[PDB]
Structure formats: C-alpha cells, structure tokens
Design a protein around this ligand. Structure first.
Ligand SMILES: CC(=O)c1ccc(C(=O)Nc2cccc(NS(=O)(=O)c3ccccc3)c2)o1
Ligand SMILES: CC(=O)c1ccc(C(=O)Nc2cccc(NS(=O)(=O)c3ccccc3)c2)o1
Ligand SMILES: CC(=O)c1ccc(C(=O)Nc2cccc(NS(=O)(=O)c3ccccc3)c2)o1
Ligand SMILES: CC(=O)c1ccc(C(=O)Nc2cccc(NS(=O)(=O)c3ccccc3)c2)o1
Ligand SMILES: CC(=O)c1ccc(C(=O)Nc2cccc(NS(=O)(=O)c3ccccc3)c2)o1
Ligand SMILES: CC(=O)c1ccc(C(=O)Nc2cccc(NS(=O)(=O)c3ccccc3)c2)o1
Lengths: 328, 328, 328
C-alpha cells in the first residue's frame, strides 16, 4: 500500500535532520517534540508532509525521495515559524503560510544542486535558511496579521559577575545544546534525542556531545552573558558541524577528529559574529554558521594521505564508510 | 550611413528592456517617457547613448551590439538616477555622473558573462542593480552636491481600515504596475507601453498583464499599506519574472504557464522581504527580486519532458521558439 | 640550517603585501613599521610567523610557502587587530586572539583556491578581509575583554568651506596614502615604503604613486570631508588595484595603463560606497573595494590583441613578464 510507504518517507525525512536514516529514530524525535509543545510538533509535521508531497509532484529523483533527503527542510521551517510568533499557542491561521513556504524547499534545494555538483558538494541547510530569513524579514514585528517577536542590538556594556557562575547549569548546557537543533529547550527532549542518535550509530552521538561541549566552552572567552549559555543558544551550531566533518564526509581518523574540533570552534565564533551583525534587521541567526563553516572545510585540499574525502555517492554512515574505505 | 545604423542600435537598446527587439516599440517607449517627464527622458536617452558608445569602444561582439543587448542598461540607470534626486527638475550638473556610471555597464555585463557561461545562463539586470546601488550608497542624503531622497525603516504599527478600500484604483494598479518598469507612474504611459508590447508579440503582453495582477494580489495577504499598492510599486518585479519564465526561455506550455505564475508569486514575496531589509541603509529595492527569482527558476532540473529549456543561441521570441522546437 | 630558511620565508611573506618578492624589501618594511609604533610591529610579526607555521603544518604546496604566498595575510591581520583597539598600547592579552585568527588564514586561502582555479584567478586578499570582519563583528565596542573603537554613520550635513583648502597637505596625501596600506600614517614610513618598492622594480613604484594620486583626486568630486583626505584613508585602495591591473597580471602596454587608471577610479568610488554602507554595523571598510574591483577587471574579455592576460604560472614581475611575452 502506497500510504505506508509515504509515512515511512516522512519519518525518514524527520530523522534526517541529524544525518540519521532510520524510522525508529524518527518516532523518537516526534515523541520528543510532542513532549516539548504540541503546537510546534503539529506545525513541523505539517511542514514535512507538504514538502515531501511537493517534491513528489515536481518529479525529482526517486531514490532521493525514498531516502528522505527532501523532508528534512520542512520540519525545520515549520518549527521555526511556530517558535518566532507573538500571537501565542493555537493560532490556526499560521498554518496557511506554512503550506506555502514549505513548497519553496524542494525548488531551492534543486537549484543549488546544479551549482554545487561541479565541485561535488552537498546542499547542507541553505534552503531552510533562505526561506526562513525571507519570511521573517517580509513579515516583521509591525505587522497586522503575523507579528514576530523582538530582537534588538545591544546598547550598553553587559553586567557580569564571575562570582555567581553555577557549575550545575554550565554542565547542563550540553543536552539542551543538542536539543536546540529542533528549537526545543527542555533537558528531557535533549536526552531523548541523544538516545535516538545512539540507537543508530554511536559515533554520531559522541561527536554531537563533543561539539556541544566545544560550543559551550568557546563562548566563555568573549564574555557572553550567562543567560544565552544557559538557554543553550551558543551550542547548537557546533554539533552539526562536528558531526558533518568528523565521521560522515571524511573517513574517520584522529587527524579528522582534530579537524572536526577546529570546525566546531570556528563555527562557534562565526555564530557569535553573525548573531551580532544580523540583529540590526531584527532577524535571528539560524544555521548560517554551520553551513558556511562546513562548506569551507570541505573545500580544503591537503597532501596528507590520511585526510580522504569520500564521493557523495557512497556516504551512508561512519562505520560503513570506514569499512568501504578499508576494503578497496 | 553609419549614423542611421547607430540610432537604430540605440532604439533597439531602448526597446530591449521588456524583451522586445523592434525599433517601432522603441519609438513608442520614448513617446511614453516624454509624456511622463521630459527631464527623465533626456537622462535615459543620454545614458543609453553613452553605454552603447562605450560598448563599441571596448570592442565586444558585433552581433550583440547590433541586436541591442548593450543598451538596455543605460536607460534604466539614467532614469533611476533622475528619479531619486532631491535637487528638482533641470539640475544640469546631474548629467556629469550619468556619463561616468553608464560606462560601467558594458564592463560588468561582460565580466559576469564569463562566469554564467559555464551553466548557460543570461545576465538579466545585475549590472544596472550594482551600478545604481553603488551610486546611491556612495552619495547619500547628507551630501553637498547630489543629495538623494529619504527612505526610512518602519517604526510603528500601520493603520489600515478595510472599509475604505476602493475597487477602482485596485483594478487601476495593473497599467501603472506595468508602467513602473521604467519608473513612470502615469496610467497613460502604462497603456502606451502595453500597446508597444502588443505590436510585437501578444504572448509577452498577456504574460505581463498576468504578472502585474499576480503581484497586486500577492501584496494583500501581508497587509501592505494601500498607498504602495495604488502607486504600483508592488507589481513591477512580477511582470519581468513572468515574461522571462513563461514564454521566452522555456518553450510555451501550460506547465510552464503555472511555473511562471509561481515565479511571479515568489518574486513578489522576495520583493517585500528585500524592501524591508534594505531600508536600513537608505537604499530602495530595484530589480533585485526579479534577478534572483528568475535565476533560481532557470537552474531547476526536472524529469518531466514538457519542461524544455532552450539554448541561449536560439531564443528570439515565443512564437519563433515554439515553431523551432516543433520543427526538429 | 632550517632556521635561516624559515626567517627568509617570513621576510618574503612580509614583503609580498605589495606584490614584491625580495628579503631586502622586507627588512625595509619592518624598519618602517618599527618607526611607526613598536607594538603594531610586534603584533604583525607574530601574526606572519604563526600563519607561516600553520601553513607548514597543514602541508600545502612547498613552492608557494617558499615564495611567501602564505605569509602576507598574517601581517595585515595582526596590524589591523592592533590598530582598532581601545585598551591602548601594550595590552599583552591581545596576543592571544592574534594567534588564533592567524591560523584561519592558511585554511581560507586554500578553500577559495579550489573555487577560483576554474577561471584561473588569484585569491587577492579575501582571507584577511573575512577574518578581520569576523573578529571585529564578534567582539564589538560593548565588550568586556577586547573592546573596539567606535564608528558611527553620518547624521548631519557636513560643513565644508572651500576657502580653507591647503595645497601643501593635499599634495602630502600621496606618501601617506601609499603608507596606509599597512595601517601607518606617518610620512616617513611612506617614503621608506616607496624606496623599498623602488629597489625591486620601478614600474610598481610608479603605478603606486599614480594610483594614490588618482584616489586622492577622485574623492574631491563628492565633497568628502577634508580630514579623511588628509589622513590618507581615501587613497590606499587605489594603489593596490592600479599595481595589480597595470603591470603584474597584464602585459604592460598603454591600453593596459589606461585600464589601470580606470580601475583606480572605480575602486575609489566603490570604496566610498562600502564605507558609507558598512558604518551601520560599526565595521570599517578594509581592502574589500580593491578585491572586488581587481576581480571584476580580470574577468573582462575583449577582442583587442594588445590586452593579453598572462597565465598564473608565469607572473613574476612586470619586466620579466614583458620579456617573456616578447620572446615567444
Ligand atoms: C541537515 C543536514 O545538514 C543534512 C542532512 C543530509 C544532508 C545532505 O546534504 N545529504 C546528502 C548526501 C549525499 C548527497 C547529497 N547531494 S545534494 O546535492 O545535497 C541533494 C540535495 C537534495 C536532493 C538531492 C541531492 C546530499 O545534509
Ligand atoms: C537550528 C535553528 O535554526 C534554530 C532553532 C532555534 C534557533 C534560535 O533560537 N536562534 C536564536 C539565536 C539568538 C537569539 C534568539 N532569540 S532571542 O530572543 O534573541 C533570545 C536570546 C537569549 C535568550 C532568550 C532569547 C534565537 O535556531
Ligand atoms: C531586461 C532583461 O531582463 C533582459 C533583456 C534581455 C536579457 C538577456 O539576458 N538577453 C540574452 C539573450 C541571449 C543571450 C544572452 N547572453 S548574456 O550572457 O546575458 C550577454 C550579455 C551581454 C552581452 C552579450 C551576452 C542574453 O535580459
Ligand atoms: C525597475 C526599477 O528598478 C525601479 C524603478 C522604480 C523603482 C522604485 O520605485 N523602487 C522603490 C521601491 C520602494 C520605495 C520606493 N520609494 S519610496 O520613497 O520609499 C515610496 C514608497 C511608497 C510610496 C511612494 C514612495 C521606490 O524601481
Ligand atoms: C598582496 C596581494 O594583494 C596579493 C594577492 C595575491 C597576490 C599574489 O601574488 N597571488 C598569486 C600569484 C600567483 C599565483 C597565485 N595562485 S593562488 O591560487 O591564488 C594561491 C593562493 C594561495 C596559495 C597558493 C596559491 C596567486 O598578491
Ligand atoms: C589595508 C587595510 O586593511 C587597512 C589599513 C588601514 C585601514 C583603514 O584605516 N580603514 C578605515 C577606513 C575608514 C575609516 C577608518 N577609521 S575611522 O575611525 O572612521 C577615521 C575617520 C576619519 C579620520 C580618522 C579615522 C578606517 O585599512
């Protein structure tokens, strides 16, 4: 029956946000989202369903849809449209734009696909960034139908007293950091996401934890206010970069491990920079630093024989990549 | 005599703004411009003449100049320099910068030509955008020689009463929308431009009207203030995108018709977004959304056999493209 | 002994800022920097040393390192980090970020190298611009550890009285203009830099002087305040563009001479534009106009046989390029 295949496709698309291709992980992710806020989960599921349907209508490649590559952008756009909303919970009209902008994810992810194929690179999360920035800038806070929350550039020297830092929450910032990938801020959903990652491949989970820790440490060297670190907004760009560079697109080796740690640090600093720059327009920084940093560390060329870049036709998950590299 | 050939070249360059290659259409366009404001027409004609002469001096391709591809950027830069001016009518010194910046149109349109040729794409209007943004940002409002008018970001929630909407002007917004391509705002010049388009090819005229209507409708779903819609600033980016995607660069078919309508809607929303974003610097959004949207819908690849993309060496006008596709 | 070779490498890297490859020129540059401000020289030397060491560790091409192509970005990032600092002279903690960001110069200059090689173009100064913009935006003025100085957009109509212009300083603006390439503002260091350039190749020195004069003249046509022209900030982007286009990457001929002068003028106007635009974020414009203008005048294609573009594998310095072109 086609319907079961379709729902398998949407589950895989939901799972594919953190480079994991497994329906059980998708079920766990949906359970975590419903633990967080039901309205956000509804918006995300609607977004991914509509994105997959539009991709099917435009008749792109069959294997790509069957693997879920076309569904991991709808869930993010739905969740981030439901988060930055001033109307509150259960504002049904918000479901109208979610249908429209989701349709723009299959198109853009195809267009960039023609440009990046020359250098054999992936289209990481650029369509989601473009669509969400477009919508948030088009609506604005002073809108009569879909108002947005306020972001404003800093105006005075922050007040920090180092005698009040609390180690408990500083350590706690890791699960919240890994949970903030989907926009959630509860420790429980962070733990559930960690379990869902670990079910499929341990290496991804370990690298996500290391990246979150790197992001949290990197923000204490420029005197970031403690509230941002506690909330976890300073460590959700590092995890994705660390996962992408560490084991997936490079064959795993200790040199690539160090390179991934460097990627996490660079992503964190670029994230701070873009967060301060984009605050003038009133827009938030969302997965721009990860895209730029991951793209700039996959174009580097070295003569060291241990840093091997896999072709895009074979990347499945780190252990399989290792065995494939060793076999031939 | 060379002089007659030269004036034929400038007339074709003037006509080429709306993808039409015919001297009679150019005469009609000039008549409309002189109906609007004589000073603006003088500036535009000077710009196109200087741009064509510079292109001839740099010795680019002969056929391109003879077809007018090098003259459709000077007229726009001249008109938009004459529009955003605070000194008033008949400020002769303004003719000095117009000579200089026009010379920068043949250069840029060549440079981008080397980059885009890899993927076989056109350089739609990027040189005009780059030059005008450069000039407007360099001068600024607080200038002692060439001051500019004021644009400022919104600061308070707009006041809209839906009981005062007037259907007459809302319907009227279509001819003004098609006339705003050259910067004019009079219904009479809009009608004249429509006639000039219809003389050469009916399909272009029909698609321009449909695109203008789409742009006008798309702005009522985000509560745009009525003055902008009445003035026609919300429907001059959609017409160009609809014309470009509908019949010119794709073989005409109902699938491409729907794709062109989608292009118009996407261009309108991106136009709103860029208009709100660029207001911080004090610059207006001018033909950026059309360029980006048209470029992002010519790189899409599909397996449907009815969406055929013509090579750039054969695009003449939609009926000829249809007959050429059917013949072989 | 390897150590002597290493110090030769860092000297060549220091010299390679103005397209000159000679240790004696490097010694002269260091002498000028130490004449200006010892702290700035310390920061620059540390930056170039760390950049060269990182490039060696990443194991890039051997000839490129031996020629100094990897050391001309560290000195600039060190100098510009030492200039825009509010803490004052001898703030030792500033040496910590200088070590980190310098390590990001070998990486980026490699990544862009894979993209630009398709069209056979160089990576002029983009890594330095990216790194410095990232750091300055990330820290900001309202920072608790590394505060920056303040740049603010203009708010009122400037006051200029043409009866007070002083020809002495207007003529003086040329050596200061050529000296502001490294961030110094003293006439003596400008003269020393001019001598250092002249020792290796007269053509580079002459073109630098012509470019500085062009930049100084171009700023009096838009009523720039006199303080900026006196300080020399209006003529350090033109010199680099004139040197790059005039003799290095094109075979020297009078047509290319005129083209280089045009490049200087275009770079100056784009510099004014970017300076006014980037002031909203609080960042300064640093070698962006030179990069963009030089890149856009190396992609132009003409049928004139006298405008010949050399391959990147043979560019050494203008006289050698001339003799090589004539020989075959
Ligand atoms: C969230 C995130 O960062 C992420 C998850 C998966 C990916 C990804 O990029 N996978 C992938 C794997 C192999 C090949 C390609 N090729 S592609 O050009 O990007 C392409 C995109 C669309 C449809 C067809 C192909 C993509 O990014
Ligand atoms: C993966 C992705 O794209 C994503 C999901 C969620 C986010 C995100 O949350 N971005 C962000 C970054 C900075 C500030 C804000 N919001 S804030 O009002 O300024 C604020 C700052 C401090 C503490 C409370 C709230 C949001 O990004
Ligand atoms: C206003 C507008 O959007 C418009 C009108 C005409 C065009 C256009 O793009 N025509 C065209 C038709 C076929 C081939 C190319 N090739 S090109 O690279 O763009 C190129 C530009 C310069 C001189 C030589 C060639 C261009 O855009
Ligand atoms: C084809 C092209 O490039 C072009 C020609 C003319 C325009 C144009 O008009 N852009 C634009 C867009 C938004 C606002 C303004 N001007 S305004 O002062 O803010 C204002 C807004 C509302 C009603 C009155 C005036 C101008 O673009
Ligand atoms: C000071 C300044 O503006 C400047 C910029 C570039 C040069 C220069 O001399 N570039 C050059 C000369 C020959 C070959 C290449 N090739 S490259 O791909 O860009 C490449 C960059 C990195 C390391 C290896 C090679 C670059 O001077
Ligand atoms: C090669 C390079 O990267 C470089 C070296 C030096 C600079 C540079 O100096 N840029 C710059 C440009 C504009 C303004 C400012 N600073 S300012 O505070 O606004 C100011 C304005 C008026 C008089 C004094 C100082 C700095 O760039």
């Amino acid at each position: 029956s086609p319907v079961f295949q379709f729902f398998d496709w949407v589950l895989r698309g939901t799972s594919q946000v953190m480079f994991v291709n497994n329906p059980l992980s998708g079920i766990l992710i949906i359970l975590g989202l419903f633990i967080q806020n039901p309205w956000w989960a509804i918006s995300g599921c609607l977004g991914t369903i509509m994105s997959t349907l539009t991709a099917l209508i435009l008749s792109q490649d069959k294997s790509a849809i069957a693997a879920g590559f076309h569904g991991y952008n709808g869930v993010l756009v739905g969740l981030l449209m439901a988060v930055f909303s001033d109307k509150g919970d259960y504002y049904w009209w918000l479901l109208l734009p979610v249908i429209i902008m989701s349709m723009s994810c299959p198109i853009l992810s195809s267009a960039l696909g023609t440009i990046f194929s020359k250098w054999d690179l992936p289209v990481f999360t650029l369509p989601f960034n473009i669509t969400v920035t477009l919508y948030l800038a088009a609506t604005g806070h002073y809108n009569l139908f879909f108002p947005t929350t306020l972001l404003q550039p800093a105006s005075a020297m922050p007040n920090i007293t180092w005698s009040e830092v609390q180690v408990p929450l500083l350590l706690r910032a890791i699960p919240v950091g890994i949970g903030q990938v989907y926009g959630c801020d509860n420790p429980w959903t962070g733990g559930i996401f960690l379990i869902a990652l670990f079910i499929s491949s341990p290496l991804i989970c370990l690298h996500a934890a290391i990246g979150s820790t790197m992001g949290m440490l990197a923000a204490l060297t420029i005197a970031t206010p403690f509230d941002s670190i506690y909330f976890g907004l300073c460590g959700f760009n590092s995890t994705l970069a660390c996962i992408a560079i560490g084991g997936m697109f490079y064959v795993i080796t200790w040199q690539t491990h160090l390179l991934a740690i460097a990627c996490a640090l660079f992503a964190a600093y670029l994230g701070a920079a873009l967060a301060n720059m984009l605050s003038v327009f009133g827009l938030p920084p969302c997965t721009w630093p990860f895209c730029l940093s991951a793209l700039t560390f996959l174009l580097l060329t070295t003569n060291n024989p241990a840093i091997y870049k896999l072709p895009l036709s074979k990347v499945t998950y780190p252990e399989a990549n290792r065995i494939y590299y060793l076999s031939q």
